[PDB]
Structure 1
C-alpha cells in the first residue's frame, strides 16, 4: 500500500508550505490532485507505461487550479518515480502532519444514545489533559451498544460500554 512511499513526499510538501506560510492552499491543491487521480479515464492513463514527462505534462494539463511554480514541481517529482497513485495517501499524511503541527486532535465518541453538552464538555476537557493537545469531538452513537460509551483518540481506546463489560465478564470463564 502507498502509505510508506507517500511519507517522504508528504513531509517535504508540509515543511515547504510552512516556510512559505501557505498550508491551507496546499491542502486544497492536494485534494484536487487526488480527485483527478480517481477519474476513470486518467486511471487507465496512469496505469499504462507512458514515459514520466509525457505523463506529467498530461497530468498538469488536467489541473489549472494548481500553483504551477510549486505544485507542478511536486507532480513532476512524483511522476519521475511513478508515484502519482500515492497522491490520495500523501494528502492524508499532509492532513495528519498538519494536525500534529497545529497540536490538535480529532476524537470519536460512541454511545447507546446522544450525550448532553455537559458530558461532551467533561469528555473534551479530560482528553485535552490526557493528550496535551486541543481536541475536536465527533459523536457516532450506535444501535448495538445498549449502555455506556466508547472513546477513541488516535488508536488509544477507553471502553465503558456495557457490551464490553458483558464480554469482559464472560472472559472470566
Structure 2
C-alpha cells in the first residue's frame, strides 16, 4: 500500500489530540524530531535488528529524543512501535503538517524563476495567490536558469506556468500540427 494510506490514521489521531489540548505547536516539534532521528543511519539500522522487542525499539527512540517529547507524545511512539509502524514516522510528520496547515488556513507555495525576484514582486504574487486560494500563502522562491524569463507557481496539484519556456512550447505545439 501507499505509505500515505498507512500513516493517515496515526497523523489524524495525533492532530485531533493536539488540537483538543491546544498543543498544535508542541506536536509539530515532537513529530519533526522523531522523523529526523528515525532516518539517521545508526538509528535506521537499530530499528531493523531481529533481536530487539517492540518495547526496546520504542524506549531507545524515546531516550534519544529525551526532553523533545511530552508524556502524550511518548504514549504515541509506544503505540506506533507496538503496531509495528515505526517506518511511517517521516510520513506521519508530513501528513500532520497538512492537517495543521488546513486548520490554520495556510498554504505552502513553490516558485521558480529565470532570475532572482525582489521582495516587492514576491508580495505582489503572494497577494494574488492568497485571493484565489482564500488562504495565507507562504512562498518558497528559487532560481532556475532553464527558463528564459517569467515564473512557474505550484501549490499542491495546481500549477500556473507563466515562464516564456512554456509559451515557446505552446508555439511549437501550434506550428508542428
TM-score, length basis structure 1: 0.90
Structure 2 match to 1:96: 98
| Separation in 1, partners of 2:18, 2:31 | 12
Q: What is the Cα deviation at residue 103 of structure 1?
A: 0.4
The answer to whether 1:9 aligns with 2:26 is: no
Aligned to 1:18: 19
Counterpart selection for 1:162 from 156, 164, 175: 164
Alignment of 1:59-138 (within 5 A): 59-138=61-140
Divergent runs of 4+, >4 A: none
Aligned residue pair count: 173
Q: 1:167 to 1:12 in 2, by over 3 A?
A: same
Unpaired stretches in structure 1, ≥5 consecutive residues: none
- Describe how 1:37-52 pairs up with structure 2 within 5 A: 37-49=38-50, 50-52=52-54
Q: For residues 33-66 of structure 1, what are the alpha-carbon distances to aligned partners after superposition, in whole Å with 9 as ceiling and x for unaligned?
A: 1222123232222112333223223332333124
**Pair 1:28-2:35 in alignment:** no
CA distance in 2, matches of 1:60, 1:149: 44
Pairwise CA RMSD: 1.7
Q: How many Å separate the matches in 1 of 2:74 and 2:156?
A: 33
**1:36–1:111 Cα change, 3 Å:** closer
Classify the secondary structure of the residue corresponding to 2:65: coil
Q: Is the 8 A contact 1:29 1:65 kept in 2?
A: no
